[PDB]
Amino acid sequence: TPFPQTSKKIGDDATLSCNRNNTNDYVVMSAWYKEPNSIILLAAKSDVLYFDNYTKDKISYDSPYDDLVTTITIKSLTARDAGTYVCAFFMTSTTNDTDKVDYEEYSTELIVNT
């Protein structure tokens, strides 16, 4: 399956988490976007910048001090919260070895039904 299908009910809190494969490089940032061209948030360590019409109310960043994972929680799921959610890791080299930006990206389809 190219997309893990997370099925939840109306009103639940969906906790979406992702793990970085590269565990030996400096994570520049961790991004979350709704795949229909909507950027949810950009987390730089414990500083979260929310894009578009997104605030700390419905979606909360739950992994501010854990660098090996990224986790958000969508609260009070509605019918419009369904769709594909994408997590991404932007990382750089820690010792200038292979000077480049490494990028990881994973997707999951959230189905919020009655």
Partner: protein, 360 residues
Amino acid sequence: YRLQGFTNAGIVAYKNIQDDNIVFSPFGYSFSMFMSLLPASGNTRIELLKTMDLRKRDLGPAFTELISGLAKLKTSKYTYTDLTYQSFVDNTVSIKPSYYQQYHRFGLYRLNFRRDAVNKINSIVERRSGMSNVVDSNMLDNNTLWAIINTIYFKGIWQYPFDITKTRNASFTNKYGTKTVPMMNVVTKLQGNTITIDDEEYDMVRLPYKDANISMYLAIGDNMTHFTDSITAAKLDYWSFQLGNKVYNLKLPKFSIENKRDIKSIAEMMAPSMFNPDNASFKHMTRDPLYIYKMFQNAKIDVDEQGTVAEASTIMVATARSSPEKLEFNTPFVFIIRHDITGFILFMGKVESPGSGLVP
């Protein structure tokens, strides 16, 4: 991995504006030059790292810091700052797949610049930032293939607003021999001081904004060129630390300024290869020869008794036609809108001060 070089880039960009009726966004220029680091490679990347005073080891954390700073600009409704960034690359350009996968969500748009690119780009920028008609018709031809737009909007409300009961005083310049302008007046306590900078007396005042750590600093002195040529981020922080509570009779003119300035000179002094198609190495985005030949910024500020409204748009494009403006102000003052936490300089400029000064 600090953003000292980031802010100093815009500071130097302002210091190279040979004029006195200036309204400029050092943060907009710095942000454009910093975002240019993602596609840049080789000599262009090295020049950009030099101007930002960063090494290859500090580029990752730097962005991190930047993001955190951006997270501290939309923290209220009384006073806020919205920033948008768009990139427009022609359909014929063969963008590398990794670059597109990484950065296409941060506004990477593809179009045919020969099919009414002006209206399409204006519509995209208006939908993403609310500002309409940002790009002009004479800044896009059938030859342009790359266009980067960086818009910033600052809504401010004075924490201690001016009383509407004010006077209309006559300022004396040489361009306008005597011009009557409304001058807001307020007698209150503020964080200011009167310091000496390289044996030159300068009076500094801070005007905070409601529900935010953003402040408008005002500096008044004899030779404002000396004050301009001696300011850095660290010196600005030190001067802020020298300010304290004291009584002030502030006479601030109710000014409204608009600038449309070509900043290609300073941007090329900082990154020459970025403005040269023979040396422009943006190999991270595409292997096709892409460069930038013109760079402008359109800024505007309006100050009244309630607060400040400022807009700025930095445009890197392939062609444009404009004429420089030169106004010689006598005894002016310098304003700086600064985020007191991140040190970011959102806006700054120079307004003609009345002969009585800002603090009688």
